[model samples]
Target: DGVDIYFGMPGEISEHEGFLRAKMDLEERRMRQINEVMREWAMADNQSKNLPKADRQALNEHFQSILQTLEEQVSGERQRLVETHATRVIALINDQRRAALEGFLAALQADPPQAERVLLALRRYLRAEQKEQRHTLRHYQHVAAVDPEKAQQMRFQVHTHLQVIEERVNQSLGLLDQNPHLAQELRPQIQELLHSEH
Candidate 1:
């Protein structure tokens, strides 16, 4: 074998494959909970003459919990991917995250008012992350100017962080673009605030 031309390192290849499987498993668990909630909603609507107010409220709370759980898991996965593979895996993870978020929004859209709340929360989360990235970028730039040799060594690290921020914002834009109705209402404000050199 003239050197494993494709993967190059068997251990690295296996680790990547394992991480992928873990990602899929996390997604599957999240979807399962989502489906359960949807099923419960359907039953409440169709089987009950009048769903109790408390039960309805509880159901909504559970939906919110599911959203939080998924968000946390996805965030953790992104951090893990960044540490392990840097930019190589970011695009793939972003695609998966985008699809997962769209699915979540679609499920919530059954209740238009509640869906708006969920959308707002997601927008806030993205905005906060973008703000943090901007601050981090500024810190790196300041340090780079102060120490030329250290800056040269840190150049790749800074670039990787910048790529993450760019991809995250782009993913948010894609989500907004896909939901034009919401985008029309929210995108302009978000775009105005997101103006940056990143």
Candidate 2:
């Protein structure tokens, strides 16, 4: 539920959900394929003992080729999955950032006095989040190369940063709500900002 708070536009949440489901499906398929390959290899190993040296040698080579191919496929699929996840995360963060800036600009147009305060707060908040985003992107870029523990830590940090950004956005909305007149004037702009194609 909280994972998608920052995605203000329609379809974004479902897109993320779809990505997750597809990833799971891929994992299941990969597991099944690996199991089937292993089963075939086991049977082949049992039968190879009855064959001549030449036939056994060929069988061994065939087994190694199949294994190497599977390894390559697994590696490529993993890389693709990591890149897809990272790209989606980056896009979501960037979209939220763009919307936040648009909201601030709309506030400036509707109420310059309040806009200055809003701008200052937004800038301060965004500075921290932008730093986190940079770090997170770097981590994602090298995650496959990192140790499992390090990768897990990086993911945790990214999750924390995302939650922080969500909180900041909610607070900003709350602040805007405090000023009824200003909120009224900015409501349409804010809605437009959130719904606009990014």
Candidate 3:
């Protein structure tokens, strides 16, 4: 228990699924091992076969209390953990929405025979954008089981936020193949935009 513990997110929640499962499993295994070893201690060893039964029983009760406290702490935080995961998901989508616009702008700026490749990629990427957005919604739907109102609010927040990005991309999409100078003009104050959640 003296080791450092970390719980941070750098990407989508689904992306960190392994870490989440591993972290949960680690504590679960530790709890199970604690119980198993305590059971072993419950069995009187040769050294203390009949030596102060009440003393051993007191020690057993002490460990049981400690285990009970640890379990209760974990249980009480269950909802908070869910809330934290939901917020992190919200933060990721927020960051990703901003990152996406820059990606579009950067792609538009790619110059090689009028960026035929960027156009191809952008076309499919925007086409696929809605489905990607749905993944976030699906996650929120799961969150909704525990928090209907918060999940709904987050859905709107992320939906509108991504809508901003999508609309901006659409504007640039029509304007692309227009002129070189105007390309970068579409990028005013982009880097300092509204994703403070990151």
Candidate 4:
């Protein structure tokens, strides 16, 4: 994978330079092939029509060569895109996990009267859930990176995931307002850091 070659930077070209050049060459060839194909489907200019017999034969041979090169490049590009995208997804997931871990740790240490054992269990559960969200976000981000034109279609799916969590947080805070039991359950654990934006 290209990711293994240069970590997760999509613009890295040192290791993939030769591969990228080949892909570009193939794309050029594909365009040439497509132009040649259009000669049969579209109008030909008088200059093209007046070409010598040998030049006409040479044109056909050149197009055949380009067509072959283009086929190989198409397959290579598909593989490269997949590998690079997977790497990006993994990197992003790592980022989210790191961010979430800091929040969980800070929340645990803020204030106390909360049972140590219970806090530990909740922290563990938070870590697990954060990992799951990281994985899901990674997948969605990868898909968005690859075929961004369709990202609008997937945007709502991601938005829904985020909204559900936000709603639950809001609900918890509302309960804390009305119920002394809920307030006691949550107050000591609330830290200034938790309200701070990353």
Candidate 5:
């Protein structure tokens, strides 16, 4: 068989789930057709249908070797793909965390009135801020624990992200301290929150 003939057909199916499923269905149909055609061929030639012992043995050995090599290649490739994806995904998650924290702090500074509405917004914003930070940190710790080889890289990235959060917190604190509406009633509470976080 010409290897070039095999080249016309796809080697592996597409990666998308829907496409992969469709391709598998097509492959199953092809296999069924092949099996039926082989059955018809066997029925027409009884003498040639039964392979000689040596040929049968050779075919079995060849198929086993092919299967073994495919299995090994698949295992190695899967591991490589996972590691490549994990690196990118973890970095993306950390970036989102940093952005979330900065956004919450910016909202605190930019929102006006400093009244009930502002307070409610602050509560939600701070809650989201804390949640994203904790989520990112938990993921960071998990990755570090499991993949210590990348721990230092992950830690440095997270630290840089948190530093941005810290800077935003300071900017918000300065804004709130000078806000004219924040009088005796809410000033102390706002200052305390800033201090606690800083």
Candidate 6:
């Protein structure tokens, strides 16, 4: 059977947003369920007047264990869910960046392309990506505060993805430096790259 295979790009809500949204949804469910059980337990507490002191204490102890079990369950599921979502977000963003780079490279290689305009625009595009990564850094920090192990792995993967972007673009910039056709175009590109720092 032939099927449409999915190729990836996120919508307006980025991978970062999706990851945070999933985490938020997970947390909300846990909290809501916990409070639900807790409120019901309190409602059940009203019946305690009919029981002996020892029976009432036993009832409380049993409910305490139930609450404790809920805590452990939430913790375990949080870690697993966190790791799973992180893997997907990293893969998605990594591939999306790579895809953008390849498309820019295609434009740069177009016949009669303006190497200077295209290459500089690519750098601008990359600069914006770098800034987006910077924006995500604080969110990653928040994840690390909660799940250090999974967060570190995410950080490592993204840093390398960012490095590859840098490496590929630098190669293009160096090529522009050597292209004799870019004799006039080269300096402006270099100047733009250098001065965009501020």
lDDT of each: 0.64, 0.70, 0.59, 0.57, 0.58, 0.71
Off by over 4 Å in 4: 1-114, 127-148, 164-187, 190-198
Runs in model 1 with CA error above 4 Å?
1-110, 113-119, 196-198
lDDT of 2 at 118: 60
Q: Higher lDDT: candidate 2 or 5?
A: 2
lDDT of 3: 0.59
Q: Of the candidates shown, which would achieve the greatest lDDT relative to the real structure?
A: 6
Candidate 4 TM-score to native: 0.36
| lDDT of the structure predicted as candidate 1 | 0.64
TM accuracy, model 3: 0.47
- Model 2: weakest 10-residue lDDT segment is 189-198
| Model 1, position 6: C-alpha lDDT score | 70
In model 1, pairs of residues that clash are none
Model 2 score (lDDT): 0.70
**lDDT by residue for model 1 (6-109), tens:** 75555645556866776788778777977886787677556444667787677677667766886787788767854766454455445555665665455445
Question: Candidate 3: which stretches are off by over 4 Å?
Answer: 1-21, 37-68, 72-107, 110-115, 124-132, 152-155, 174-198
lDDT of 5 at 144: 82
**Per-residue lDDT of model 6, residues 1-198, tens digit only:** 133326443567676677778789889999999998898889879888899999899889978989999999999988887787768766766676666667666666677667656665666556655654664676687878999888977987768765765676577566555456763565676566646632
Which candidate ranks first by TM-score, i.e. highest?
A: 6
lDDT of 2 by residue, 1-198 (tens): 675658543664565676787689888998998899889989999998899999999998998899899889988998898788778776766776666666655664564447456645455445545555565667765874766777876776778876876676566667677667767766665555444411
Name the TM-score of candidate 2.
0.57
Q: Kindly list the per-residue Cα lDDT of model 3 for residues 77-136, writing each as its tens digit.
A: 665666666676667665665566566567666664245445544444453455456665
The weakest ten consecutive residues by lDDT in model 6 span: 1-10
Sort by TM-score, top down from the best: 6, 2, 3, 5, 1, 4
